[PDB]
Structure formats: structure tokens, C-alpha cells
Amino acid sequence: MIIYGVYIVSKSGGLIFNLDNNVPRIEHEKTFTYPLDLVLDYDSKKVSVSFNRKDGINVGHVLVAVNGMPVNGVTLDDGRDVRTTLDAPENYPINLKFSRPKMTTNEKIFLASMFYPLFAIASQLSPEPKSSGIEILEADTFTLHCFQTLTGIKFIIISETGLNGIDLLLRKVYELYSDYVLKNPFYSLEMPIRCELFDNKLQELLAQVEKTGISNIDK
Amino acid sequence: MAFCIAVIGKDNAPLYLTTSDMEQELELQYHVNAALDVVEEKCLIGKGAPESKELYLGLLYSTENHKIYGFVTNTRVKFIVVIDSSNVALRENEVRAIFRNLHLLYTDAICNPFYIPGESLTSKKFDRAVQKLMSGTA
Amino acid sequence: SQSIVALLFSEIVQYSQSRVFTVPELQTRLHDLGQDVGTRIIDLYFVRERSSKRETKLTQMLLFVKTTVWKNLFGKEAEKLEHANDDERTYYIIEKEPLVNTFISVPKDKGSLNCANFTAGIVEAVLTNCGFPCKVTAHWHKGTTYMVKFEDFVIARDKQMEEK
Amino acid sequence: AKKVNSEFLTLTYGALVTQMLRDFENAEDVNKQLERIGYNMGMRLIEDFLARTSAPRCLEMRETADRIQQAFRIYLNIQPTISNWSPASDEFSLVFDSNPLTEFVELPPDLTNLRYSAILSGCIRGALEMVQLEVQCWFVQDQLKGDNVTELRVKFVRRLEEVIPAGED
Amino acid sequence: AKKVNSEFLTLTYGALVTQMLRDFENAEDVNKQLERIGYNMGMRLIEDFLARTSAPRCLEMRETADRIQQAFRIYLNIQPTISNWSPASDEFSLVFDSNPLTEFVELPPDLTNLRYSAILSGCIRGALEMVQLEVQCWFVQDQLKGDNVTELRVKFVRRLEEVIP
Amino acid sequence: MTIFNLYIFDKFGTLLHYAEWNRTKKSGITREEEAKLTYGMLFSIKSFVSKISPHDPKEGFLYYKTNRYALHYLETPSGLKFVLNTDTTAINVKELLQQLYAKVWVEFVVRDPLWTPGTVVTSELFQSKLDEFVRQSPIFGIRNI
Amino acid sequence: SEEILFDCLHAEIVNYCLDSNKEHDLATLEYIGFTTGYRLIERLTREVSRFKDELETMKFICTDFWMLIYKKQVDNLRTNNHGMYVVQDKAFRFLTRISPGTKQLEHAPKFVAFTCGLVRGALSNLGINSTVTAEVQSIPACKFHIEVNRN
Amino acid sequence: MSTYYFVIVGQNDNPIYEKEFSTVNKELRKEDHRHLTQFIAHAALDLVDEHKWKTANMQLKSIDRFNQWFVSAFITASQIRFIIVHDNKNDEGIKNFFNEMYDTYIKNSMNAFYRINTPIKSPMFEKKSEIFGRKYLLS
């Protein structure tokens, strides 16, 4: 039932609200020896690995900290760069932190931006006539459920993949939406909704659904 | 126990080494041993020397200290070893096994793409194949 | 509905936030609206829900008008009443329920004060129309709380009729 | 449950109207101003009435008509009564016997050119526009003007929401 | 009868090698033909190998080694044993006691530079680039050229990536 | 009420073939640009998940759904892509597409000498065999996991 | 599934044909291949005694060789009096993968050479001789038209 | 007969309205009655304020009796001073008459357009008052 994240977007498709329910990325450390079978590749502010995803270090695991010292985009905290640090041998044997890039907020904005067309262009040239767009997009280790307001706003959340009974939960987040837009209808789509009162009401909906009850519509 | 090995083509002989178990065949009948084979195909051939069977020839041809045991394939190849022992305690069963082995070694020399069929057996490998045959069953 | 009133009140606040420039005068405008409400509700409920009989004495009228107004407004009387010795003029009436949160509330950066003052305005109307001119402040202390500064002639008057 | 008393909503509406009469001298301005605030009401009223019930979008006008009468009976607790269709069935009339907003208030004779309860027409407008649906609504008869009961018009000139929820935007 | 259904293949291969070798005098020219023809063949074969073994895709050279030696098991009925890893895990070695595709093709043809397993090298590379793995391939040891074990070598050169959507 | 259609795309993103049975919404776009659009969209979704994944997406994308039809996706590690349209609700079809790949395509395409690599298949046997393998279970509906 | 190698390899041979000769394909494939099959044919129905010569219709031996390689049986076997004759086969494996529509006909001589180039026997119709032309009208239906090396 | 005089006083002591029913004659002297009893209402107010601080009764039937001018007080929750002044007594009429005055006053006080302490010109209220006077005072 655990929800990885919750989201809502506007007629613009802009990400209006992106509360995340605290789902951390995996981490790995191991006392690295002479040049590592991890195939380290520099790609544009990413210091990652392209191959040999061993020991639970995925390919996408971006270098996060070096020898305890943090590493920043391409170089490190102290001014050393990943390349100079790495290819110098006698530093080894050493520890390297690695994990996946928690996409900084702006990147999440970009992600929602690029996704919106897929919603609006979910093969509008469908087989089935006078069709309707996307609503449910299952994926590897998450599943996306969206609730169109049937006119206007989109309601997408990110849940545990193997689950049902979430579209009613979307209806209830729609109810929370109504509750908040009662606040100031001038406080409209144009500005994003960051009003901590409604937001902790949402996190209480989260609190209820973390516990067993998703039956017992109580929010 | 001289096994004058002799594969024959359609008519001519691709490989006919002169070897046995111990060392080379001194006796100077070689070219005229092939002539023994030719007098085979002159009088002993009958209507029989070529057949369409994996050919058991228990002594198609015999003489003193020299006993020919034959074999023929559908490809008209003549396979012949000679029992050059007036008698030794070896019975035709291992001779059949030997023509099995010789069949297989010859046809695995045949397995070469480079070696054109009907030519002198170049393979020192098929050599050592025949050589182990002789060193074993002579 | 609940939510229709919340919406109409959001349009209240927004109309103020439009043709009002700064926050304290916006609270003043809310207070004016509250006076408008009280000015007629008190005379209404003299009869129907207040035993049809007038009541003059201070604390009794305070508490009973509190309750009757809340029953015919939301049906929920204020949760407690404090009257403070250290300033006999200083009384506090405190209700954990804000009228505002029918729509859950405003930005928490620009406007420290909210509808709390508009309810305080209705309070001021009823007090001053009963015979109790007073100034009321809304504070975000222990939830929606209020404080009342009665009238001096009134404060002497009841201080005198503390006996009969 | 609505958890609130009809008179309190009426007093808030009277506070608005009186405050408009004060702040702005003319009835036409205060009326257009309130119609704007009601337009902005509708942008939340219609989504609420959808959160209470995901009604069908539209196959016909009277389907929207009884949807909105349902909504009117929801928040105002008062059952309306649709009537007076077009020959083309496109436009209808809406009946309120007594609006908590409209009632408990009569009008000083100076304000005849004022259309008082027009906040509802604004509500309908904005409600139909957030639902991407183009309609014209004005109170052809109002309880205050001497009309028996408030009567509206609902002129659905054209469409803005398509059959697929992609729509034009 | 029928110990080996496809002993036919090795004789066909011997025919092709001698046909080219007659056509093109140089061992080098036929080396390129063998490499490219292995390329096309491995492109044909990798999709079937992934229809049967139904591998996810290779993101790690230990996985690549297991996959390809499994393909050898299932295609040429041979059991290459992975060995001699790179410190960087790029190189590994495939131990063929009997190159299956040769049964005394010729031990001396009097021709060094004529490498037989180039067909395998082409197949392995073309297969790999179907699955987005540009790895070079060569042969550290080869029985025919005088060795006792024929040993293919591959070293991870580059991780190809799909681009241009 | 058989399947709507079925798509193929190489690891270079080129439409190999499109077979239609029951698609009805008559396309305003000529099919080739549509196939390009769909391949780009699917690539976008791959990037979409590969960024916003909580953990390793081992097989990544699976499929998407509408209220009134549905679609499913299959990924081939060589980079070929499989897409078909189905109804919303019946047994899963991820396995059915795996089977169609491992049998029909690997047989009646790559084992065809007269299909040059990386082009449009135009085999009447591959066409008719696709027709029959679809006619195997002309089942419409997915509810895929 | 060992066939896939040979299907692909013969396919790529169908691909490249350099203009010097049509069929650069020499028959050593055929020669060494029948010798191999006959290593597996270490027994065929010919009597133990050498004189009584029985000939095995290479038609039948062709049936068996297909079962050893082509795996599917030769069907319609029409034969003139002398060494000239033919096989009519409804299905041919390499042309099973091509569209049955009679549109791709040229690819046969690579097919028909493979049934040539098998050493002869002295007694005719003994089972091994080969010199063969093909006339594939329908795609799956190869038509290997036989001509003995003799008359 | 009895003379008839009603007065309405705002919180800020504003005389909101006054109503008459007496048989019409010597209108100047009836205006003299009006101002006579309005200043009487001022003094009677200065009295009835502490009188209401004493008793929160429904209605203060008597506040002063000028021996020809009679002061009857029905003060409201909003402290709206109401007085009937008459040369003759009729208690039963006046008690529920001030009651019904208060009632129709509530009715016409609800309208948002009225603001505290403001004269109200609604002739509907005039005829409501007249009907009450014909009911509880006049015959």
C-alpha cells in the first residue's frame, strides 16, 4: 500500500503539487580495490557507472560521496575531481559511496512537464473510436493511476505496484482538492498549491492509508 | 603381422603405407602388393569385389604369410588390410572392429575440406590414425 | 452546504483583499462585516432563543448570549470563558473552532489575523448593542481566542450593581 | 449535513450587498462585481458538485439541467424545478421558490436597476466554464422584483468540452 | 545413427573457407569475409538465443559470459568454461577443448594468418551489438595454429546506448 | 471481437510492420508518422520511469490503460519493440506477446532468407501466420499486471 | 535446435553470388557429407556375399539421406526407364521459409547442387550417384530433376 | 378617548420614528404633543436607563406618570428605546402592542440595508403599525 509519491497537475499540465512520501533510494559502499569493474562514465554533471552493476550498485547509481568526502556533480567537495581521484592508484584500497540521483525538485518539474503530453497524446488516434485517454499506467516497480476530473485537472499518484482499490483514494484526494480550493478560488491553478494546512490534511490521508484502513473511507 | 594398409580409389590407391605394430615393412613386395590387389581386380574381383554393403571379406584372398581381408563402401572405395601372419591368435572379430576403425579414420581424413578426395593421404593425422591402428592390432 | 459558506466567505476575503490595500484595514473591514451581522442577529434572538426576556447583567449575558448566538450560528457554543482578575476589563472568550476554517485557512506569511477578527466583529456588535461597548482582539493563542475590553462607564456601572 | 444555519449565510450575503452599495456608488458596477465573484464561485462549486457525484458529462441539455438542479438542492437544500425549454431544447428555465440568499432581504426602492441575487448567475457561469461548457444565464424573473419565484435562463450557446477528456485547451 | 545431426555444418564451413581461399589469395581477405559473415550470422542467432534463453539483457560482463557460453551449449553443443577475467572484468576466456565447428579441418594447411574461429568472432560481435554491447573479439589461443586449447577473447570496449528517439 | 492492431520497432526505432484487425477510429495521420510518434512516446516513457523509479526497473515499462480500451508493450533485449492494442479487461497478454516473438517472429522472419535485416517484412507466410496466431485466441482485454 | 545455424548459413550463401561464376559451390560438401552419412549408414540392405549384386534405388537412399539431413520425406517419385528421372516434392525446407507464392524461384541451384556430387557406384541404381538439376515451379515444391552421370 | 403616541429611539438616542392615531384636530397642538413627549422621552430615557439596569423585565410598563402624560417603556435587546405616551391608560393594549411593535420591528430590522439607529420609511411598516393600532389601541 505504501505510496512513493503524490502529485496533481493543472490545465497547463504544470506540476502544481509534488508531495513525496519518503521512499529512499538504495545505497552501497564497498572497500574498492585497484581500478573497479564498475564502469565509471562521465556524462554531463553525472558521475555514474555504465556497466557491471554488481553488489547492488545499479547502473544508474550516481556517485554520491567519495571516501566519506562528498562529491558534487563532476568533482568532489575538496576540489579533487572523480577522474583524478580514481585513476591515481595508491589512494586505493578505498570506500566509495554510490546511490541513485534523487532528482532535485526542478528535475521533477521537468519530468511532470514531459509526461503531460503522454497523458494528452495517449494515442488520441486510438483504435477504439471516440476514445478516452490514459488512466492506468503500470510499470516495473511503481504504478501510476490518474483521475481526470472529467473536466480539467489531472490527479496522478505513485503507489506500490501490486495493489488495487486506489481510484477511490484518488476520489478522496479530489475531495481534499475541493476542501482546499474553498480557501481562495483566486488561489487558482496559475499559482501552485503549497498551503501547509491542506497539505497536512493530505499527509493525514497518507497516515490513514499507511495503516491498514483504506476500506473505512475515513481520511 | 604386417598390415599393408591400402585404401583404393575408384581404381588407383590413394594411401597404402607399409607399417605394422613394431616397425616398417622391410619386405619388398609393396608395389607388387598393390599388384596383388590388381590381380585381385583381374581374377578375384568376380562380380563381387564391388558391392553395396559394408563389406566383410574374411579372406577374399589368401596366401602364405599373407592374408587379405577386404572392405568396400557405396562410394566404391576399396579398404584392405592384409593379415601377414600365417596364423596368430587373433580372430576375425577384432578384424571387423579394425575395419570399423579404419572406416572411421579414413572418413575422418575425408572430413578435411582442403584434401581433395582421390589424392594421396597428406594427413599426418590420418597417418597417426593408421599408425595407432597398426601398433595396436598387429 | 458547509462548503458553499466556505466559498462565499473566500469571496468575502478576496473582495476585501482586492479593494483593500493592507492587512490591518482588511481586518477592520471584516470587523465591519461582523458589526453588520450582530446588529440584527441580537434583536432577532432576544425573543426566540433567549427566553423572550431581556437580560442585562454582565457575565450572565456574556455567557448566555455567547451560547445562544453560537447555537443559532453554528450550533456549537464557545468551549470556555476566562475573565481575568489582573485586568477586570480583560476578559477572554475562546473557541477552538474558527469560523474561518470552513475553508481551511490563508497563507501563514502575510496575514497574522483572519476571520477570527470578523467573528470578533459580530461579538462587538452584540455586546455594544446589548449595552456593552467593547473592543475585541483575536489572537492565535490556544487556537482561535478572543479578548474583550468593555466600556468604562459600563465597567463602573456593573461594578456598582455588583450588589443590589 | 451542511452544519450551518440558513440565516447566517443570508447575513453574509447581505453584508456583501450592503458593502458594495457603499464602496461603489452604482448598482451596475456592484452587480457586475458580484457577478465576477460568482463566476469565480462556480470554478469551485462545479468541482465540488463533481466530487460529491461524478455526473455524466453531457449527452443532452436537460441532463445538465437536472444535474445543476441536483446541485442547487444540495448546497441550498432547496429542490429547484426545471421548466420552459426551447423548441430546440437547448435552453431552459430554473425555479427557486426562496433563496436563503435572496430571502430574509427585501430591497429599498432606489435599487430597482440592481439585480440582487445575480451571484447565482455568476455561479452558474463560472461553474460551466471550468467544466469547459459555454452557457448564458440571467434571472428572467427574480423573487424580489415582484416575480412569484426567481426564474433564470440557461442559454447553452455552444460546447468547449469534447467527447474524449483530452479536450481543447 | 545420429550422434550428431549437425556435423554437416562443419563441412559446409570447410567448403566456404576453401572456396574463399581459392578466390581470395590472402588469409586477410578471407578473415574479413569470415568476420562479417559471422556478424550477419550472429545477428540472426542472437534473437533466437533470446527467444529461448529469454535473458533480460546483459548489463554486466559476468552475465554476458554466462549467456554466451549458454548459447554455445545450446547452439554448437559445446561447454566453454569462462576463465581469465580482467581486473576490470573486461576480458574473459572461453575454453574450447574441441572447437566443435572443426573436426581436423587441417592441422597444417601450410598457412598461418588463416584463422578459423573468425566465424565465431563475427557471430559473437554481431550478436552483442544487437543487444547494445560493442565488444571487440579475437583469439588468444587456437589449437589449429599450434595450440592445445582454442581460446576466444573478448574485452569490454564500449557500452553502446540507444539514442536519437 | 479480435485485437485491434500490432506494432514492431527495431532497436533503431523503425517500424517493421503493422497489422490491423479491428481498429475503427480512422486515423488522420498516415501510419508511418503515427508509428514514429508512438516509438518516440514509448522511448519517453522508458526515460520517464528510469528516472522516477523508486528502485531498479528490471523490465521497466509494462503497459498503459484507458477506460475504454487498453494497450500493452513488450521489450526485446535486442531492442526490438512489440506493441498491440487490446480491450481493457481479459487475461494478461504479456506472455502472449512473448510467445508470438519467440515463435512467429523468430520463425517466419529471421529464418526467412528473403527478409533482409532491418526492413519491412512483406512475407505472405509471415502475414498469414500472424493472422493465424492472432486467430489462436482472438481475445480482447488485458488487465495486465 | 541445431538447424538454425545451417538455415542462416545457407541463407547468407543465397545472399552473396559474385559475378565470376554463378555457382562457385564445389561439391566437397556433398562428397564428404554422404561419406559421413554412410559412417552412420554402417548397415544398408545389401547381401553379405559379394557376387550377388543388388542395386539400391538412390531414390530410396535419397529418402534416407533427407531423413538424415532434410528430415522430411520425398513425396512424388516419377522415374523413366533409364538413369534419367525426377523427384516431385511438395515441400522443401529452404523454400518452406519463403512465401509459397511462386515469386522467388531463382534460389534453387544452391539447393540442387547439394544433391549432386555424390560418388557413383559401378552397378547402376545402387544408391549413391548424383548429377542433378532443379525446376522449382512452386516455392515449397522443389523439383529436383535427376540425370545420372551415365546415360 | 385615549391619545396615541409611539416613538422609536436609536441606541445613540436618535428618534428614529414616531406614530400617531389620535382623532385629528389642532395639528399644532398635536406637534406640541410630539415635541413635549420627545423631550419627555429624553428625561424618561435618563430614568429608564437605570430602570433597565435594575430589571431586565419584558417591558417596563411605567417609568414616569406626569399626571397627564404616561410613560410606558419596552426596551429592546439592542437597547432601542420605545415609549407610548398617552393621556389615558390601556395596559392590555399596550403590553402586547409593544410586543407586536417589536415583532414587526424585527421583521423590518433584518433587512441588511437598515443600519443601526436609522429612520425607516417603509410604508409597509406604517400600515403594519396602523393595523396594530386598530387592533390593540384604536376602536
Swiss-Prot record, chain H:
It is found in: Cytoplasm, Perinuclear region; Endoplasmic reticulum; Golgi apparatus. Keywords: Cytoplasm, Endoplasmic reticulum, ER-Golgi transport, Golgi apparatus, Transport. May play a role in vesicular transport from endoplasmic reticulum to Golgi. Involved in dsRNA uptake. PANTHER family: TRAFFICKING PROTEIN PARTICLE COMPLEX SUBUNIT 2 (PTHR12403). It holds the Pfam family Sedlin_N. It comes from the Eukaryota. Its main location: cytoplasm. Belongs to the TRAPP small subunits family. Sedlin subfamily. GO terms for cellular component: cytoplasm; endoplasmic reticulum; nucleus; perinuclear region of cytoplasm; TRAPP complex; TRAPPII protein complex; TRAPPIII protein complex. Gene3D superfamilies: 3.30.450.70. CDD domains: TRAPPC2_sedlin (cd14825). SUPFAM superfamilies: SNARE-like. Part of the multisubunit TRAPP (transport protein particle) complex. InterPro entries: Longin-like_dom_sf (IPR011012), Sedlin (IPR006722). GO terms for biological process: endoplasmic reticulum to Golgi vesicle-mediated transport; Golgi vesicle transport; spermatogenesis. This is Probable trafficking protein particle complex subunit 2.
